[PDB]
Design a protein around this ligand. Sequence first.
Ligand SMILES: CN(C)[C@@H]1C(O)=C(C(N)=O)C(=O)[C@@]2(O)C(O)=C3C(=O)c4c(O)cccc4[C@@](C)(O)[C@H]3C[C@@H]12
Ligand SMILES: Nc1nc2c(ncn2[C@@H]2O[C@H](COP(=O)(O)OP(=O)(O)O)[C@@H](O)[C@H]2O)c(=O)[nH]1
Ligand SMILES: [Mg+2]
Ligand code: NA
Ligand code: NA
Ligand code: NA
Lengths: 335, 33
Amino acid sequence: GITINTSHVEYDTPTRHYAHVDCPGHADYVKNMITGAAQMDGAILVVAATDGPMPQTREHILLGRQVGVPYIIVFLNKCDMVDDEELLELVEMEVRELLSQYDFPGDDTPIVRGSALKALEGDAEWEAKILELAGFLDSYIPEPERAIDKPFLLPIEDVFSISGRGTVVTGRVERGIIKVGEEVEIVGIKETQKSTCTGVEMFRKLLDEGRAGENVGVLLRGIKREEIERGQVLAKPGTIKPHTKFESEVYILSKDEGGRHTPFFKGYRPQFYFRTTDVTGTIELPEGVEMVMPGDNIKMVVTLIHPIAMDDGLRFAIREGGRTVGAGVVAKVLG
Amino acid sequence: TKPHVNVGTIGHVDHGKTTLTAAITTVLAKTYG
Ligand SMILES: CN(C)[C@@H]1C(O)=C(C(N)=O)C(=O)[C@@]2(O)C(O)=C3C(=O)c4c(O)cccc4[C@@](C)(O)[C@H]3C[C@@H]12
Ligand SMILES: Nc1nc2c(ncn2[C@@H]2O[C@H](COP(=O)(O)OP(=O)(O)O)[C@@H](O)[C@H]2O)c(=O)[nH]1
Ligand SMILES: [Mg+2]
Ligand code: NA
Ligand code: NA
Ligand code: NA
């Protein structure tokens, strides 16, 4: 099992409540960013003015882009140690160039020069820089799109045939909302079919609609139990398409996490667990990469035997006989 | 009521992510408590 090491704190600005996550070491940042163990609507990139950008500075920006972190604000730290406006502008420039190298808008990125330590000590000059950072959290990061406002999507778990009412599929609304009368496409594994929602049920009782986060049953028109299966998803028509090949960032569990004990090479054929089911696939390692050690994280191009409904940001587990040995996130659909 | 937003600190080890994390918490509490 993946070991998740985190530090959670919450704080408020007059207009917003923030759920902040901080991690100990680089491996924690990799794991937690790929698995979605903390979803960042925005990340605060801390760069010590004394060191300037360092290896994990680059890797976290790179990971951030690959896993979908939409915004990055920079807090140039330890400025209490650096009194040289020119040195500070040098570092800032280095940071903007780095952000741009990975498609973040370096030029438009807020960069606050501060000292977390002296601010923490009660020094008013520095506390002001913290307030400035919080201002950018408020102004630079837009109100995130709530689950209910996204197009409907429900990972199908079970498939029932019901006495005279019709075919029923169950699962948790991952997002959006489904109402009786709305159309729905059944995507993945087979050719996309279409149908109509003639009823949403929850706790035995008939409802008008199902909502993100709720476990419901969806009665479908005309479709028969044999035409639908686990791994497929119900979605507002035209919002998600099935794909077989994609680029992804994956983290391979370490030995201590109960993962593999040896590296795997090209030709490794594991199962990719997407939402509800396993699907075998073939892998392509990045140029120059010959093996993947337990604990490593790499960009991996995957080709599934059977299609799956997916879009950038979709999480998946890599497994060996039902046992998890890796975690990944779709970075880019290829087709 | 209030909009909820998820954020976090990324960056190289020892650059001050944990210190910044505490600093944000204490300063916002003393300013907007
Ligand atoms: C008191 N001082 C501030 C702490 C410390 O002694 C540290 C150290 N290297 O000795 C930290 O790195 C320390 O400053 C630090 O950075 C810590 C962490 O990053 C985390 C995070 O993010 C999540 C869970 C646990 C930890 C932690 C226990 O390693 C934190 C300890 C922090
Ligand atoms: N001078 C100075 N030291 C700082 C500042 N912020 C953090 N430090 C020190 O840098 C070291 C590492 O800080 P820490 O928060 O643990 O870094 P982290 O590994 O990124 O979480 C500690 O000794 C801190 O006291 C700062 O603004 N100024
Ligand atoms: Mg830390
Ligand atoms: Na240094
Ligand atoms: Na603010
Ligand atoms: Na070899």
